[PDB]
């Protein structure tokens, strides 16, 4: 719009630059960084309060044991496997710690996943049946096929897939996205191509098949 | 040598061409095809006898249930997961059948893996301890790192890794090789680069991390 009363924020607004330049390069370079600009300041304090509840030794950081022990929004809990996936996604420094800014990303990611869970649990509230996994993952940007969606339900769930199992699936898909980023940063594979969600979906189908 | 008495066979000898051109394109195009030229004719009949023992419905082909039920050389047995990996490696036609030529490859692969198992089970006969997995896989051509070798022992074994568990590991590494072949055949990633075992080793490290 060119309407004065309805002006939308632009990506990379000058007002955010101060904050952005102070952030660690690892954080700024990562595929999930744009999650950070979706969070209003007024939710900052809520997320920070949550962070404090998970940070059991008050280190100002989250370690894998804290993720395994933590309660997250919507009653989400993480198995040891899933806590490790969250570390591999969000500890972009590879130091074994999740910083507050890294947790903010993880929190938003979990809230996106939770929203799609509730939206796609239509046959039975609080569970995803196998046929609901495909659309929920597509909505999140993971363009997989039916074969793959049924394989993920089988690997990560039982009849139905509860919220925790859904978050496990989403963490696997996101860790594969990080792995993809790492692989294609290797200069052996030529100049880095822009991300193509359809091509990445095919990559995710293939890597999923390696899990069985 | 230029010695008449000690002439070595050359790869792609004219005498094998008749056979090679009659083979299905899927088989000829696959990364494991050179396994086939390592098998002398006199072992043909032994492998065929073994094939017949696994082929329970005499279809002239092996299906996944036959792999799950089959006994292979060295007392090797395949879990459901590993039988499926063997299908993903060797059913290059994607028809759900392993042909005799596809089984020949699988048999040779298993014999290579079995030989390295016996060679590397030094601390205790009939088992690989975690530190023996790294050299055995390097000997097979899979250039992984220590982190990865210990992750594979953890994922696929217990204290020690028996033969069947080792074959499971080898099948995972080989299925990842097939996956790599498939991924890099996609024209999105540019002209296909020649295979580089060191670069592939790094790829295997990364994909291994996705299994936990
Ligand atoms: Ca802490
Ligand atoms: Ca970190
Ligand atoms: Ca059969
Ligand atoms: Ca076949
Ligand atoms: Cl589909
Ligand atoms: Cl190493």
Coordinates of C-alpha atoms and ligand atoms in Angstrom, one line a residue:
Chain A
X1 CA 0.0 0.0 0.0
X2 CA 1.0 3.6 -0.3
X3 CA -1.5 4.3 2.6
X4 CA -0.1 6.3 5.5
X5 CA -2.2 4.6 8.2
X6 CA -1.3 1.1 7.1
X7 CA 2.4 1.1 6.6
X8 CA 4.0 -2.3 6.9
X9 CA 7.6 -2.7 8.3
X10 CA 10.2 -3.5 5.7
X11 CA 12.7 -6.4 6.1
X12 CA 16.1 -5.1 7.3
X13 CA 14.7 -1.8 8.6
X14 CA 17.5 0.6 9.6
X15 CA 16.2 0.7 13.2
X16 CA 17.2 -3.0 13.7
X17 CA 20.8 -2.6 12.4
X18 CA 22.3 -1.6 15.8
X19 CA 21.1 -4.9 17.3
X20 CA 21.9 -6.9 14.2
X21 CA 25.6 -5.8 13.9
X22 CA 26.2 -6.6 17.7
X23 CA 24.8 -10.2 17.2
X24 CA 27.3 -13.1 16.8
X25 CA 28.1 -13.8 13.1
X26 CA 27.1 -17.5 13.6
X27 CA 23.6 -16.3 14.5
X28 CA 23.3 -13.8 11.7
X29 CA 24.6 -16.3 9.1
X30 CA 22.1 -19.0 9.9
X31 CA 19.0 -20.1 7.9
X32 CA 16.6 -19.5 10.8
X33 CA 17.8 -15.9 11.5
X34 CA 14.6 -14.3 10.1
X35 CA 12.6 -15.9 12.9
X36 CA 14.1 -13.3 15.1
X37 CA 12.5 -10.3 13.3
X38 CA 9.0 -11.9 13.8
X39 CA 9.2 -11.4 17.6
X40 CA 7.8 -8.1 19.0
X41 CA 9.7 -6.5 21.9
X42 CA 6.7 -7.0 24.1
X43 CA 7.1 -10.8 23.9
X44 CA 10.8 -10.4 24.7
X45 CA 10.2 -10.4 28.4
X46 CA 7.8 -13.4 28.2
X47 CA 10.5 -15.5 26.3
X48 CA 13.2 -14.3 28.7
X49 CA 11.1 -15.4 31.6
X50 CA 10.7 -18.8 30.0
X51 CA 14.5 -19.0 29.3
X52 CA 15.1 -18.3 33.0
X53 CA 12.8 -21.3 33.9
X54 CA 14.8 -23.7 31.7
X55 CA 18.2 -22.3 32.7
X56 CA 18.6 -24.3 35.9
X57 CA 22.2 -23.1 36.7
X58 CA 21.6 -19.4 35.9
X59 CA 24.5 -19.5 33.4
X60 CA 22.6 -17.2 30.9
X61 CA 22.6 -20.2 28.6
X62 CA 20.9 -23.5 27.9
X63 CA 22.7 -26.8 27.9
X64 CA 21.5 -30.1 26.6
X65 CA 20.5 -31.4 30.0
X66 CA 18.4 -28.2 30.6
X67 CA 16.6 -28.9 27.3
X68 CA 16.0 -32.5 28.3
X69 CA 14.6 -31.3 31.6
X70 CA 12.7 -28.2 30.4
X71 CA 9.1 -27.5 30.0
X72 CA 8.3 -25.4 27.0
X73 CA 5.1 -23.6 25.7
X74 CA 2.0 -25.7 25.1
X75 CA 3.3 -28.5 27.5
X76 CA 6.1 -29.4 25.0
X77 CA 8.8 -31.7 26.3
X78 CA 11.9 -32.9 24.4
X79 CA 13.3 -36.5 24.5
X80 CA 17.1 -36.8 24.7
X81 CA 17.2 -37.2 20.8
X82 CA 15.1 -34.2 20.1
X83 CA 17.0 -32.0 22.7
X84 CA 20.2 -32.9 20.7
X85 CA 18.5 -31.9 17.4
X86 CA 17.6 -28.6 18.9
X87 CA 21.2 -28.1 19.9
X88 CA 22.4 -29.0 16.4
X89 CA 19.9 -26.5 14.9
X90 CA 20.3 -23.5 17.3
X91 CA 23.8 -23.8 18.8
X92 CA 25.3 -22.2 15.7
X93 CA 28.6 -21.5 17.5
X94 CA 29.0 -25.3 18.2
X95 CA 30.0 -24.5 21.8
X96 CA 27.3 -26.7 23.5
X97 CA 25.3 -23.7 24.7
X98 CA 22.1 -22.1 23.4
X99 CA 22.3 -18.3 24.0
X100 CA 19.2 -16.2 24.7
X101 CA 19.0 -15.1 21.0
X102 CA 19.3 -18.7 19.9
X103 CA 16.6 -19.7 22.4
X104 CA 14.4 -16.9 21.0
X105 CA 14.6 -18.6 17.6
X106 CA 13.9 -22.0 19.1
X107 CA 10.9 -20.7 21.0
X108 CA 9.4 -19.0 17.8
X109 CA 10.1 -22.2 15.9
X110 CA 8.2 -24.2 18.5
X111 CA 5.3 -21.8 18.5
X112 CA 5.0 -22.1 14.7
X113 CA 5.1 -25.8 15.0
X114 CA 2.5 -25.8 17.8
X115 CA 0.2 -23.5 15.8
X116 CA 0.3 -25.9 12.8
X117 CA -0.3 -28.9 15.1
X118 CA -3.5 -27.4 16.5
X119 CA -4.6 -26.3 12.9
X120 CA -4.0 -29.8 11.4
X121 CA -5.2 -32.0 14.2
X122 CA -8.7 -32.2 12.7
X123 CA -9.6 -35.9 13.0
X124 CA -8.9 -36.0 16.7
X125 CA -7.9 -33.1 18.9
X126 CA -4.4 -33.4 20.4
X127 CA -3.1 -35.8 17.9
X128 CA -2.0 -35.9 14.3
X129 CA -3.2 -38.9 12.2
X130 CA -0.7 -40.0 9.5
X131 CA -2.5 -38.1 6.7
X132 CA -2.3 -34.8 8.6
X133 CA 1.5 -34.7 8.8
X134 CA 1.9 -34.0 5.1
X135 CA -0.1 -30.7 5.0
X136 CA 1.2 -29.5 8.4
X137 CA 4.8 -29.9 7.2
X138 CA 4.0 -28.2 3.9
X139 CA 2.5 -25.3 5.7
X140 CA 5.8 -25.0 7.6
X141 CA 7.8 -24.9 4.3
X142 CA 8.9 -28.6 4.2
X143 CA 7.7 -29.8 0.7
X144 CA 7.9 -33.6 1.2
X145 CA 5.8 -36.3 -0.5
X146 CA 3.2 -38.8 1.0
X147 CA 5.7 -41.7 1.2
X148 CA 7.9 -39.5 3.4
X149 CA 5.1 -38.1 5.6
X150 CA 4.0 -41.7 6.5
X151 CA 7.6 -42.7 7.1
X152 CA 8.1 -39.8 9.5
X153 CA 4.9 -40.7 11.4
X154 CA 6.1 -44.3 11.7
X155 CA 9.7 -43.3 12.8
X156 CA 8.7 -40.6 15.3
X157 CA 5.3 -41.7 16.7
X158 CA 1.8 -45.6 17.2
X159 CA -1.7 -44.8 15.8
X160 CA -1.6 -41.1 16.4
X161 CA 1.2 -38.6 16.8
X162 CA 1.1 -36.4 19.9
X163 CA 2.4 -32.9 20.2
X164 CA 5.8 -34.0 21.5
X165 CA 6.2 -36.4 18.6
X166 CA 5.3 -33.7 16.1
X167 CA 7.9 -31.4 17.6
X168 CA 10.4 -34.3 17.1
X169 CA 9.4 -34.5 13.5
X170 CA 9.8 -30.7 13.0
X171 CA 13.2 -30.8 14.7
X172 CA 14.4 -33.5 12.4
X173 CA 13.2 -31.5 9.3
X174 CA 14.9 -28.3 10.7
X175 CA 18.1 -30.2 11.5
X176 CA 18.1 -31.5 8.0
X177 CA 17.8 -27.9 6.8
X178 CA 20.9 -26.9 8.9
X179 CA 22.7 -30.0 7.4
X180 CA 21.8 -28.9 3.9
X181 CA 23.2 -25.4 4.7
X182 CA 26.4 -27.0 6.0
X183 CA 26.8 -29.4 3.0
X184 CA 26.3 -26.8 0.3
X185 CA 28.6 -24.3 2.0
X186 CA 31.5 -26.8 1.1
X187 CA 33.3 -25.2 -1.8
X188 CA 33.6 -28.7 -3.6
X189 CA 29.9 -28.3 -4.6
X190 CA 30.5 -25.0 -6.5
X191 CA 29.1 -21.5 -5.8
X192 CA 26.3 -21.6 -3.3
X193 CA 22.9 -21.7 -5.0
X194 CA 19.9 -19.8 -3.5
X195 CA 17.7 -21.9 -1.3
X196 CA 14.9 -23.6 -3.3
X197 CA 12.2 -25.1 -1.0
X198 CA 11.0 -27.7 -3.7
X199 CA 14.6 -28.9 -4.2
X200 CA 15.1 -29.1 -0.5
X201 CA 11.9 -31.0 -0.1
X202 CA 13.4 -33.7 -2.4
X203 CA 16.5 -33.7 -0.3
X204 CA 14.5 -34.2 2.9
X205 CA 12.6 -37.1 1.2
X206 CA 15.9 -38.8 0.4
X207 CA 17.5 -38.3 3.9
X208 CA 14.3 -39.5 5.5
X209 CA 14.7 -42.8 3.6
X210 CA 18.1 -43.2 5.3
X211 CA 16.4 -43.3 8.8
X212 CA 15.0 -46.8 8.1
Chain B
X1 CA 54.5 -55.2 -15.6
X2 CA 55.4 -55.8 -19.3
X3 CA 55.9 -59.5 -18.2
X4 CA 54.1 -62.1 -20.3
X5 CA 53.6 -64.6 -17.4
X6 CA 52.1 -62.1 -15.0
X7 CA 49.6 -60.2 -17.1
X8 CA 46.9 -58.5 -15.1
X9 CA 43.2 -58.1 -16.5
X10 CA 42.4 -54.5 -17.5
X11 CA 39.1 -52.8 -16.3
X12 CA 36.5 -52.9 -19.1
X13 CA 38.2 -55.8 -21.0
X14 CA 36.6 -56.4 -24.4
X15 CA 35.6 -60.0 -23.4
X16 CA 33.1 -58.7 -20.8
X17 CA 31.3 -56.3 -23.2
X18 CA 28.8 -58.8 -24.4
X19 CA 27.6 -59.5 -20.9
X20 CA 27.8 -55.7 -19.9
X21 CA 25.6 -54.4 -22.8
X22 CA 22.9 -57.1 -22.1
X23 CA 22.7 -55.9 -18.4
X24 CA 19.9 -53.5 -17.4
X25 CA 21.0 -49.8 -17.5
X26 CA 20.0 -49.3 -13.9
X27 CA 22.6 -51.9 -12.9
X28 CA 25.3 -50.6 -15.2
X29 CA 24.7 -46.9 -14.0
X30 CA 25.1 -47.7 -10.3
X31 CA 28.0 -46.8 -8.0
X32 CA 28.5 -50.4 -6.9
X33 CA 28.7 -51.9 -10.5
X34 CA 32.5 -52.6 -10.3
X35 CA 31.8 -55.1 -7.5
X36 CA 30.5 -57.3 -10.4
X37 CA 33.9 -57.6 -12.1
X38 CA 35.6 -58.8 -8.9
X39 CA 33.7 -62.1 -9.0
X40 CA 35.3 -65.0 -10.9
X41 CA 33.0 -67.3 -12.9
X42 CA 33.8 -70.2 -10.7
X43 CA 32.1 -68.4 -7.7
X44 CA 29.1 -67.7 -9.9
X45 CA 27.6 -71.1 -9.2
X46 CA 28.2 -70.8 -5.5
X47 CA 26.5 -67.4 -5.3
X48 CA 23.6 -68.7 -7.5
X49 CA 23.2 -71.7 -5.1
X50 CA 23.0 -69.2 -2.2
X51 CA 20.5 -67.0 -4.1
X52 CA 18.3 -70.1 -4.6
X53 CA 18.3 -70.7 -0.9
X54 CA 17.1 -67.2 -0.1
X55 CA 14.5 -67.1 -3.0
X56 CA 11.7 -69.0 -1.2
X57 CA 9.0 -68.6 -4.0
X58 CA 11.5 -69.5 -6.9
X59 CA 10.7 -66.2 -8.6
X60 CA 14.3 -65.8 -9.8
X61 CA 14.3 -62.7 -7.6
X62 CA 14.6 -61.7 -3.9
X63 CA 11.9 -59.7 -2.2
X64 CA 12.2 -57.9 1.1
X65 CA 10.6 -60.7 3.1
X66 CA 13.1 -63.1 1.6
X67 CA 16.0 -60.8 2.8
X68 CA 14.5 -60.6 6.3
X69 CA 14.2 -64.4 6.4
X70 CA 17.4 -65.3 4.6
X71 CA 20.7 -66.6 5.9
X72 CA 23.7 -65.2 4.2
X73 CA 27.5 -66.1 4.3
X74 CA 29.3 -66.0 7.7
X75 CA 25.9 -66.5 9.6
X76 CA 24.8 -63.0 8.6
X77 CA 21.2 -62.1 9.2
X78 CA 19.4 -58.9 8.4
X79 CA 16.9 -57.1 10.6
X80 CA 13.8 -55.6 8.9
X81 CA 15.6 -52.1 8.8
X82 CA 18.8 -53.5 7.3
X83 CA 16.8 -55.7 4.7
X84 CA 15.2 -52.5 3.5
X85 CA 18.6 -50.7 3.3
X86 CA 19.8 -53.6 1.1
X87 CA 16.7 -53.1 -1.1
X88 CA 17.4 -49.4 -1.4
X89 CA 21.0 -50.0 -2.4
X90 CA 20.7 -52.9 -4.8
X91 CA 17.1 -52.7 -6.3
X92 CA 18.4 -50.0 -8.7
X93 CA 15.2 -50.5 -10.8
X94 CA 13.0 -49.6 -7.8
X95 CA 10.7 -52.5 -8.6
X96 CA 10.8 -54.2 -5.2
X97 CA 12.9 -57.1 -6.5
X98 CA 16.6 -57.9 -6.3
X99 CA 17.7 -59.7 -9.5
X100 CA 20.5 -62.3 -9.5
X101 CA 23.1 -59.7 -10.7
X102 CA 21.9 -57.3 -8.0
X103 CA 22.3 -60.1 -5.5
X104 CA 25.8 -60.9 -6.8
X105 CA 26.8 -57.3 -5.9
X106 CA 25.1 -57.5 -2.5
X107 CA 26.8 -60.9 -1.8
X108 CA 30.3 -59.4 -2.7
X109 CA 29.6 -56.3 -0.6
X110 CA 28.7 -58.6 2.4
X111 CA 31.9 -60.7 1.8
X112 CA 34.0 -57.5 1.8
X113 CA 32.3 -56.3 5.0
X114 CA 32.7 -59.7 6.6
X115 CA 36.5 -59.8 5.8
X116 CA 37.0 -56.4 7.4
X117 CA 35.0 -57.4 10.4
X118 CA 37.3 -60.4 11.1
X119 CA 40.4 -58.3 10.4
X120 CA 39.4 -55.5 12.7
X121 CA 37.9 -57.5 15.6
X122 CA 41.2 -57.6 17.4
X123 CA 40.3 -56.8 21.1
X124 CA 37.7 -59.6 21.2
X125 CA 37.0 -62.1 18.5
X126 CA 33.5 -61.9 17.0
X127 CA 32.8 -58.3 18.0
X128 CA 34.0 -54.9 17.2
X129 CA 34.6 -52.5 20.1
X130 CA 33.8 -48.9 19.4
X131 CA 37.4 -47.9 18.4
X132 CA 37.6 -50.6 15.8
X133 CA 34.7 -49.2 13.7
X134 CA 36.7 -46.3 12.4
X135 CA 39.5 -48.2 10.8
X136 CA 37.2 -51.0 9.4
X137 CA 35.0 -48.3 7.7
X138 CA 38.1 -46.5 6.4
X139 CA 39.4 -49.7 4.9
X140 CA 36.0 -50.1 3.1
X141 CA 36.4 -46.5 1.6
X142 CA 34.1 -44.7 4.1
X143 CA 36.3 -41.8 5.4
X144 CA 34.5 -40.7 8.5
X145 CA 35.8 -39.2 11.7
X146 CA 36.0 -40.5 15.3
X147 CA 32.8 -38.7 16.4
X148 CA 30.9 -40.4 13.7
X149 CA 32.4 -43.9 14.3
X150 CA 31.3 -43.8 17.9
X151 CA 27.8 -42.5 16.9
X152 CA 27.4 -45.4 14.5
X153 CA 28.4 -48.0 17.1
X154 CA 25.9 -46.4 19.6
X155 CA 23.0 -46.2 17.0
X156 CA 23.5 -49.7 15.5
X157 CA 24.8 -51.9 18.4
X158 CA 25.7 -52.3 23.6
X159 CA 29.3 -52.8 24.6
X160 CA 30.4 -54.6 21.5
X161 CA 29.1 -54.7 17.9
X162 CA 28.4 -58.2 16.6
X163 CA 28.7 -59.1 12.9
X164 CA 25.0 -58.5 12.2
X165 CA 25.3 -55.0 13.7
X166 CA 28.4 -54.3 11.6
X167 CA 26.6 -55.3 8.4
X168 CA 23.8 -52.9 9.5
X169 CA 26.4 -50.1 9.8
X170 CA 27.9 -51.0 6.4
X171 CA 24.4 -51.0 4.8
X172 CA 23.7 -47.6 6.2
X173 CA 27.0 -46.2 4.8
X174 CA 26.3 -47.8 1.4
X175 CA 22.7 -46.5 1.3
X176 CA 24.0 -43.1 2.1
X177 CA 26.4 -43.5 -1.0
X178 CA 23.3 -44.4 -3.2
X179 CA 21.5 -41.3 -1.7
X180 CA 24.5 -39.1 -2.5
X181 CA 24.4 -40.5 -6.1
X182 CA 20.7 -39.7 -6.4
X183 CA 21.1 -36.2 -4.9
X184 CA 23.9 -35.1 -7.1
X185 CA 22.2 -36.5 -10.2
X186 CA 19.6 -33.7 -9.7
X187 CA 20.4 -31.0 -12.4
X188 CA 19.8 -28.2 -9.8
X189 CA 23.2 -29.0 -8.3
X190 CA 25.1 -28.3 -11.6
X191 CA 27.2 -30.7 -13.7
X192 CA 27.9 -33.9 -11.8
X193 CA 31.3 -33.8 -10.1
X194 CA 33.5 -37.0 -10.0
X195 CA 33.1 -38.9 -6.8
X196 CA 35.6 -37.8 -4.1
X197 CA 35.8 -40.2 -1.2
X198 CA 37.1 -37.6 1.3
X199 CA 34.2 -35.2 0.4
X200 CA 31.7 -38.1 0.7
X201 CA 33.2 -39.0 4.1
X202 CA 32.2 -35.5 5.3
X203 CA 28.7 -36.0 3.8
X204 CA 28.4 -39.3 5.7
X205 CA 29.5 -37.6 9.0
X206 CA 26.8 -35.0 8.5
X207 CA 23.9 -37.4 7.6
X208 CA 25.0 -39.6 10.6
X209 CA 24.4 -36.7 12.9
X210 CA 20.7 -36.6 11.6
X211 CA 20.2 -40.1 12.9
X212 CA 20.1 -38.9 16.6
Ligands
LIG1 CA1 22.3 -23.0 31.9
LIG2 CA1 26.0 -21.7 21.2
LIG3 CA1 11.6 -64.6 -4.7
LIG4 CA1 15.1 -54.6 -8.9
LIG5 CL1 2.6 -36.6 -2.5
LIG6 CL1 39.1 -38.6 13.5

